[PDB]
């Protein structure tokens, strides 16, 4: 790895600098380097890794959607033939996106998940695994699409099972997992009723546990609860 | 598009 | 070049797609490829080239400024020693930025400027040459700083001389050149009075020529005139 | 920062 000669602490320091500079590709490369040092990641470090790749892949997804929309319009009736370029360029962005997802999934598999024993780390990583398979599913159109979808579902489900056993219903990781698994159901698995049920139950169980929280924990939890409500409003 | 985190 | 096997028209088509997807690094690579085909660029193509690199280098400049500010704070009294990482990472971004500028300057030198005979193309390219030397000047701190500054000044001045002879005072290229040369004077050459004089004279000469214009030309010209006024308001 | 185009 190109980061093999840099100290772990220096990689972390630079990831934080990259974040301040909105240099998310750099941030992701620094955090990949840090992961490849082989030590477990702290809570803060795990969130640097997730922020970095979320921003990188988020940009790719947004571009893919623009290009996919243009390509779809080109295959409508009465659309003039413009040649292979739209498809080629959509494929280029798609391949880059798939590469980033495979990189993240590779980090999780080698060896973040297997060393993650505490619920907060294990659920965090399994949520990421579900998320990055979900992004692969968004662009999948071939013979492996069902298997990609099932890989997302399996990771989310393992995360859900651990989170329900080991975390309070207001835990932000548990809430964010549920938010995203609900979106998986709606947007990927063609299961809007499951999506709505999950979001509602998650919201209601969190509401009932808010009384146990400090002011700062309350603020954190209610932010994600509002996202659940926002999705429910979109879907009903 | 729906909210994810 | 990696774009050597792609048709010129396909490179142009893809640059436009990249712009729609806000993939400016891709856009710049496509347009570099197009330039390296060796044919002159049309007005539209010249503006695709400039938009692409403006966005790429604009992101680099913004990041450089963030990092430079952090580095400056680290060298204040009572600042804790954090090691070489801030400097290293600022240097990394700086080197990338310098690389992009050298790439653009290389395109202009090989061989866009020498083949540009019409005022609209020649002034456009010389403005770009001034701009990219100006960006090099923003980060220069060594023995070549004066020469970099003079290279910017020389390019802007040649562009100004042609624009004054061959273009109306409302021409958007002429206006944008003057806007940027004025900023060069203020921010790079430590010449705020020259900056203010240039912006004012440019604005006033354009005002007096607006009567000659169509509605659409009027709209174009007055947009840049407002930027001159905005700078004058900032500086006075 | 001042405006440029
Ligand atoms: C140690 C750990 O992982 N803890 C943790 C606390 C808070 C968050 C978090 N909270 C919010 C609120 C609103 C938006 C985003 N939020 C995050 N980050 C995104 C995220 C990532 C994983 C799981 C849930 C949410 C995260 C982690
Ligand atoms: C053929 C050619 O180069 N013509 C040209 C017309 C308009 C513009 C232009 N006008 C504005 C208004 C506001 C903001 C930005 N504008 C541009 N682009 C930036 C620019 C580049 C070079 C010189 C001036 C302005 C450009 C070119
Ligand atoms: Ca070490
Ligand atoms: Ca037709
Ligand atoms: Ca074509
Ligand atoms: Ca593909
Ligand atoms: Ca462990
Ligand atoms: Ca050809
Ligand atoms: Ca101290
Ligand atoms: Ca350090
Ligand atoms: Ca340097
Ligand atoms: Ca010519
Ligand atoms: Cl392509
Ligand atoms: Cl670095």
């Amino acid at each position: 790895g190109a980061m093999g000669s840099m100290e772990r602490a220096s990689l972390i320091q630079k990831a934080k600098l990259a974040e301040q500079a909105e240099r998310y590709e750099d941030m992701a490369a620094f955090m990949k380097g840090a992961v490849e040092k082989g030590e477990e990641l702290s809570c803060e470090e795990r969130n640097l890794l997730s922020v970095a790749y979320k921003n990188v892949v988020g940009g790719q997804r947004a571009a893919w959607r623009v290009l996919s929309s243009i390509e779809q319009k080109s295959n409508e009736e009465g659309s003039e033939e413009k040649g292979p370029e739209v498809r080629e360029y959509r494929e280029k962005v798609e391949t880059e996106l798939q590469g980033v997802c495979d990189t993240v999934l590779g980090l999780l598999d080698s060896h973040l998940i297997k060393e993650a024993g505490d619920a907060e780390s294990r659920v965090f990583y399994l949520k990421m695994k579900g998320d990055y398979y979900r992004y692969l599913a968004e662009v999948a159109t071939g013979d492996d699409k069902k298997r990609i979808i099932d890989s997302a579902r399996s990771a989310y489900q393992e995360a859900m099972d651990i989170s329900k056993k080991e975390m309070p219903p207001t835990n932000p990781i548990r809430l964010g997992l549920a938010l995203n698994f609900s979106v998986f159901h709606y947007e990927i698995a063609n299961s809007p009723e499951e999506a709505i049920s999950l979001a509602k139950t998650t919201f209601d169980e969190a509401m009932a546990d808010l009384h146990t929280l400090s002011e700062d924990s309350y603020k954190d939890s209610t932010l994600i609860m509002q996202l659940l409500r926002d999705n429910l409003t979109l879907w009903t | 598009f729906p909210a994810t985190v």
Side-chain angles (χ1 to χ4, degrees), chain A, chain B:
Chain A
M3 299 299 178
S5 63
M6 204 185 310
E7 289 279 13
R8 190 185 187 281
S10 300
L11 290 166
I12 296 304
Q13 189 178 348
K14 288 178 185 182
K16 292 173 190 178
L17 291 173
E19 186 182 25
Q20 292 179 85
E22 296 181 76
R23 292 273 293 198
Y24 292 106
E25 297 183 11
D26 291 347
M27 190 187 180
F30 293 138
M31 288 312 302
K32 177 175 189 290
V35 168
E36 290 173 348
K37 296 302 174 183
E39 301 288 350
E40 295 186 34
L41 268 50
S42 69
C43 175
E44 180 172 10
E45 294 160 355
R46 287 190 301 265
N47 282 279
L48 291 169
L49 176 72
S50 65
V51 163
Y53 280 107
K54 176 176 186 302
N55 275 271
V56 170
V57 76
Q60 297 173 317
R61 288 165 71 208
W64 186 93
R65 288 174 191 169
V66 165
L67 299 174
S68 185
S69 174
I70 293 166
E71 189 184 10
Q72 281 186 65
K73 288 186 188 297
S74 81
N75 298 132
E76 284 176 350
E77 197 61 284
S79 303
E80 195 57 50
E81 179 55 49
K82 299 310 200 315
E85 292 84 359
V86 170
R87 179 187 50 75
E88 286 171 352
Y89 186 49
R90 186 270 298 156
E91 284 172 357
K92 179 190 166 169
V93 172
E94 185 174 300
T95 300
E96 191 191 283
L97 183 161
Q98 291 169 323
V100 170
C101 294
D102 292 344
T103 294
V104 172
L105 293 167
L107 297 171
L108 296 171
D109 199 50
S110 298
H111 297 278
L112 290 170
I113 290 167
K114 67 178 60 66
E115 294 299 348
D118 292 354
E120 283 211 337
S121 59
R122 190 165 189 76
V123 174
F124 190 95
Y125 295 135
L126 289 165
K127 177 187 170 293
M128 286 186 79
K129 181 174 183 176
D131 290 336
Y132 285 84
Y133 275 115
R134 168 161 62 84
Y135 307 148
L136 290 176
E138 287 177 339
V139 304
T141 62
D143 288 1
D144 276 343
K145 187 183 173 62
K146 288 174 175 173
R147 271 179 285 269
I148 293 164
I149 291 173
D150 204 59
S151 290
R153 180 206 60 69
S154 182
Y156 284 136
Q157 188 64 60
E158 185 179 348
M160 292 286 293
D161 295 343
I162 299 166
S163 75
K164 283 190 181 194
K165 190 170 307 198
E166 301 294 340
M167 288 170 167
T170 50
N171 179 283
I173 301 166
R174 180 168 169 183
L175 290 173
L177 167 63
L179 183 73
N180 288 18
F181 192 25
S182 167
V183 167
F184 167 87
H185 289 305
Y186 196 95
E187 288 292 332
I188 309 297
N190 195 31
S191 299
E193 289 173 335
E194 191 68 16
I196 292 164
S197 188
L198 179 55
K200 188 167 200 317
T201 291
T202 303
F203 181 97
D204 290 344
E205 286 183 37
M207 180 66 39
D209 185 60
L210 289 174
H211 75 276
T212 66
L213 303 181
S214 68
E215 176 174 299
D216 287 357
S217 294
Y218 184 87
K219 173 186 178 300
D220 298 343
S221 297
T222 59
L223 278 177
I224 304 170
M225 286 173 74
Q226 184 62 52
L227 302 176
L228 291 163
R229 173 61 55 204
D230 290 343
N231 285 354
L232 287 165
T233 296
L234 182 64
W235 295 339
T236 65
Chain B
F1 305 81
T4 58
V5 295

